Design a protein around this nucleic acid. Structure first.
Ligand code: K
Ligand code: K
Ligand code: K
Ligand code: K
Ligand code: K
Ligand code: K
Ligand code: K
Ligand code: MG
Ligand code: MG
Ligand code: MG
Ligand code: MG
Ligand code: MG
Ligand code: MG
Ligand code: MG
Ligand code: MG
Ligand code: MG
Ligand code: MG
Ligand code: MG
Ligand code: MG
Ligand code: MG
Ligand code: MG
Ligand code: MG
Ligand code: MG
Ligand code: MG
Ligand code: MG
Ligand code: MG
Ligand code: MG
Ligand code: MG
Ligand code: MG
Ligand code: MG
Ligand code: MG
Ligand code: MG
Ligand code: MG
Ligand code: MG
Ligand code: MG
Ligand code: MG
Ligand code: MG
Ligand code: MG
Ligand code: MG
Ligand code: MG
Ligand code: MG
Ligand code: MG
Ligand code: MG
Ligand code: MG
Ligand code: MG
Ligand code: MG
Ligand code: MG
Ligand code: MG
Ligand code: MG
Ligand code: MG
Ligand code: MG
Ligand code: MG
Ligand code: MG
Ligand code: NA
Ligand code: NA
Ligand code: NA
Ligand code: NA
Ligand code: ZN
Lengths: 97, 57, 48, 127
RNA sequence: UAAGGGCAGACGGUGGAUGCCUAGGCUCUCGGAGGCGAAGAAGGACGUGAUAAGCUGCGAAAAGCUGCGGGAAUCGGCACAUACGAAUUGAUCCGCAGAUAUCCGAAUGGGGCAACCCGUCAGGCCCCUGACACAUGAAUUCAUGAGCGAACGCGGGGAACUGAAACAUCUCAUUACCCGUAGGAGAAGAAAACAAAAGUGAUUCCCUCAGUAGUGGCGAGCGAACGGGGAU
RNA sequence: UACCGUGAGGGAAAGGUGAAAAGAACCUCGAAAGAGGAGUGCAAUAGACCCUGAACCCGUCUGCCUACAAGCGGUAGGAGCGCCAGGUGUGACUGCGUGCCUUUUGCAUAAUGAACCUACGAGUUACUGUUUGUGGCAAGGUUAAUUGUUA
RNA sequence: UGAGGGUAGGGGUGAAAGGCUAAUCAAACUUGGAGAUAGCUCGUACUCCCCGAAAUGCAUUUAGGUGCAGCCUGUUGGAU
RNA sequence: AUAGUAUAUCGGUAGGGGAGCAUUCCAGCGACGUAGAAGGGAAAAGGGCGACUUUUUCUGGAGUUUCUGGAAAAGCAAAUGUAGGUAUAAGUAACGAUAAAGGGGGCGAGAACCCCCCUCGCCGAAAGACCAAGGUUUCCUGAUCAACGCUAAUCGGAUCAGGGUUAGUCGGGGCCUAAGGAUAAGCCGAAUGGCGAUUCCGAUGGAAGAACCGGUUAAUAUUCCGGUACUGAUAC
């Protein structure tokens, strides 16, 4: 189990991109990292194979990402309840996604 | 037959006083203007003593 | 000059091969010591 | 915590006024290379190129191509083609690089070690 | 003056010390368990991928096949890149039970230089190829065994260096080592026993008795039991 | 394991970029190896053999001294010169001075020993006594195996 | 002279040299007893302070070893 | 050291005694650190005396430490001591048979050495050709010149990739037995085991089953193709 997954909308809580939200693009389970859309861009130097510097999202360690509250816009911790199990936001109590 | 002692840095460096690379004997070519060795044919132009010697294609 | 090692594949297996080791109690004692050490090469029958 | 950033900023600002080129890990002995560096030290670059081109030492061909690079670095950092009679070799040094060890057999079963040495060469130019 | 040299400083080269760190070791405590194998083991050979050296997993059903329980969005090992796919009709992953499981190896149809060669017998295909069976020994066709593997147990054999400031009795030592063979432990065990007119009653192990009584080229050394206190 | 041995058998060395590969597009000199830039990054003198980065050993530069001078290379004096207010580098000239270890009656000894640096490297523990410093109890002192409670 | 066999360590083999038995032989090699024993040689690492010898006698399968005495030192009690 | 400041005393090997410093870790009371810890370079200052300590500055980029007590893997200059690194002799010995080279073209950044051509020289009962043992891809071709090649190298028995070995008769094996080996029935023997047939295994030998010449590939050839033969089974 992980507290985030693909398609989730999450807010960064630590790092240089703290205070920024975004959608989760890919989850690297073994390394415990995920790509969030529009955050943590990098300038990769690619040879033609036309070449040039290109932009891409670098993964953020998942412990710095929290699922945004359904009702309010702030990041909250989550839990699972039988109501199979399902995620829900600890700040408001509503089911998540 | 065998060195009784290792040589100090000073003794080794004193011997190497006479280890010098020899400078070439250079001259300018009156035709090309390039450096060439005195008493040889200029490899750039092919000339020697004011006359063409190696007509280079 | 002639040196000590003059190879013959027929002689090698007859003297040191797997089937000659297994034919006596002392040969099987050698095989047990090499297995307990974890040797990759058990006899000359392996290198072939 | 920004300390090493501030130390490095000053290091880069000084490098803008230094014109030099480097040769790293040249697979020849440093002592023989040094014989060539003593010949062109403190000498006008146009005369040194001809001296290196007609030298009888084999290490000179490598050094000749490094001097050409040093001059080109000077023009890049000064934004003009160099004149004739203007630049000169203000500094040059040869340092011993890492050694490759090898084996050479000797009589009666003994073996000796052979060292295949390397060197670094750095050249500075100045007006 | 300096071909050269000396000393000091500045900046570098080489080399990989030191500091910090850990992915691996070392010594133990508590609980469990103490085997695997002819229904073919331990250990190997050869194979197995879209791609594939080597490891890992697997066995011609070959990084794997089928159910049941779990779990919920990623997955096709280490391990990338490229390529094609799987999966909310629940993939991958975890627990349990099944299917498949080439050749060698106790190796057991006969041979053999391990991973190979050659058969008899019954079936089915077509010079060949499938799929069965076929060792020996101890019991009554049937049942059993063999081989491998930590230490601990019990048996059969059994050194020397060394100490005795030499050395032969003696010591090292009923040790090292070799061989046979059990079990989760084994061996011992229920008085033809100790004791001393006072008594205790199977065996085993701990603390004492005690470096004592003895033994001994009475040298170097070796060394109890009774009785008492415990575990059970 | 590699490697060594016919075989039984013997038997190594070798850890660390960065938070994240963001592992350096592109230009200049070069035939290209190598570098100078640019860019990424807190940092590239973190650039792949990459944390830190010592010694022996090796260079370049600057200051002072040195081509009439002779011994374990220092030590005690002492001008001049060069740097930064009396500190620091050097050292003309002078006095004195035969390394160190070990073994010996006695070693400059022509007795032993070492190329140099970094790292490694040699009176420890158990038990039984005895003397002693310090304590507890005292005509008495002390428990051993083991047992109970708790954790 | 080729191929394949056989003899194994106080054993083998030897037209005999103590020769040869895997570059090893008046007793091979490997592992173990095992860190054998060595009255012998070499080596033994921080600091300062106080005191400070002996190279003799006796005995010894003893003579370059050791036991006792003599000579040093700590603590303690006496004066000598 | 004695007396409580005075008197005396303070060279030392073997050796006896006293008092301390540093190192690693632990307990307790407490401190320091990204506004920069440890380590590394430089400088200055301290200590009855010393082992050592403190401060400043550069590097460095995450740990460190006072005091009191406790426990040790608790300190190197030398053992023909060990590992790793780097020196000296020294740009010295040497570059492995005195069969030998010269020129012109070529590819190429680069040629004494590579390719082609002309000349010269060496072997020729071999230094040529075919097998066995042993090796195991070194064979051919393209790319590459870091390492290897005692020089350089555009070359190589080097690195990487691709390719290449074709049998009714050849050589083996299938059959047979020798030395020797393993056994059966038996014999011997603390154990482990030692012996023991006309049996089996085991070629270096014996087979009543039989092929030779030529040509083609960059790399195979009694094997592929051509020609001309031979030998077993099997069905009509
Ligand atoms: K068989
Ligand atoms: K350095
Ligand atoms: K003078
Ligand atoms: K001598
Ligand atoms: K012997
Ligand atoms: K520490
Ligand atoms: K080629
Ligand atoms: Mg000279
Ligand atoms: Mg070289
Ligand atoms: Mg030349
Ligand atoms: Mg040789
Ligand atoms: Mg340095
Ligand atoms: Mg380290
Ligand atoms: Mg299911
Ligand atoms: Mg004795
Ligand atoms: Mg059993
Ligand atoms: Mg019991
Ligand atoms: Mg730095
Ligand atoms: Mg570094
Ligand atoms: Mg005079
Ligand atoms: Mg003497
Ligand atoms: Mg003496
Ligand atoms: Mg003297
Ligand atoms: Mg002398
Ligand atoms: Mg001596
Ligand atoms: Mg010496
Ligand atoms: Mg000496
Ligand atoms: Mg020394
Ligand atoms: Mg030393
Ligand atoms: Mg004789
Ligand atoms: Mg011999
Ligand atoms: Mg003997
Ligand atoms: Mg012993
Ligand atoms: Mg010993
Ligand atoms: Mg005195
Ligand atoms: Mg003696
Ligand atoms: Mg005495
Ligand atoms: Mg005095
Ligand atoms: Mg004194
Ligand atoms: Mg020597
Ligand atoms: Mg000489
Ligand atoms: Mg000479
Ligand atoms: Mg030679
Ligand atoms: Mg010569
Ligand atoms: Mg030659
Ligand atoms: Mg020939
Ligand atoms: Mg070839
Ligand atoms: Mg070369
Ligand atoms: Mg090739
Ligand atoms: Mg035939
Ligand atoms: Mg037969
Ligand atoms: Mg051919
Ligand atoms: Mg033919
Ligand atoms: Na000078
Ligand atoms: Na099958
Ligand atoms: Na700082
Ligand atoms: Na040290
Ligand atoms: Zn010219």
């Amino acid at each position: 189990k992980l507290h985030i997954k693909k398609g989730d909308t999450v807010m960064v809580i630590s790092g240089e991109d703290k205070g920024h939200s975004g959608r989760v693009l890919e989850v690297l389970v073994k390394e415990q990292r995920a790509i969030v859309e529009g955050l943590n861009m990098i300038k990769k130097h690619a040879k033609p194979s036309q070449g040039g510097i290109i932009s891409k999202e670098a993964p953020i360690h998942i412990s710095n990402l929290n699922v945004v509250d359904p009702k309010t816009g702030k990041a909250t911790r989550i839990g699972r309840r039988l109501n199979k199990l399902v995620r829900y936001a600890k700040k408001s109590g509503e089911e998540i996604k | 037959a065998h060195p009784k002692r290792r040589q100090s840095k000073t003794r080794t460096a004193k011997r190497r006083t006479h280890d010098k690379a020899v400078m070439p004997t250079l001259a300018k070519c009156p035709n090309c203007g390039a450096w060439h060795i005195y008493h040889t044919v200029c490899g750039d132009c092919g000339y020697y003593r004011g006359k063409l010697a190696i007509e280079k294609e | 000059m002639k040196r000590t090692y003059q190879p013959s594949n027929r002689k090698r297996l007859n003297k040191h091969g797997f089937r000659s080791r297994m034919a006596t109690a002392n040969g099987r004692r050698v095989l047990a010591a090499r297995r307990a050490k974890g040797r990759a090469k058990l006899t000359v029958s392996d290198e072939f | 915590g920004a300390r090493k950033h501030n130390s490095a900023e000053a290091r880069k600002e000084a490098l803008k006024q230094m014109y030099f080129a480097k040769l790293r890990n040249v697979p020849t002995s440093p002592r023989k290379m040094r014989l060539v560096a003593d010949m062109i030290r403190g000498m006008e670059v146009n005369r040194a190129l001809g001296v290196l081109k007609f030298s009888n030492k084999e290490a000179s061909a490598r050094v000749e191509k490094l001097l050409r690079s040093a001059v080109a670095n000077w023009e890049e950092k000064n934004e003009r083609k160099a004149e004739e009679g203007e630049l000169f070799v203000s500094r040059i040094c040869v340092d011993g690089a890492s050694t490759l060890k090898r084996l050479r057999p000797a009589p009666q079963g003994r073996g000796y070690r052979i060292r295949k040495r390397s060197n670094h060469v750095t050249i500075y130019v100045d007006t």
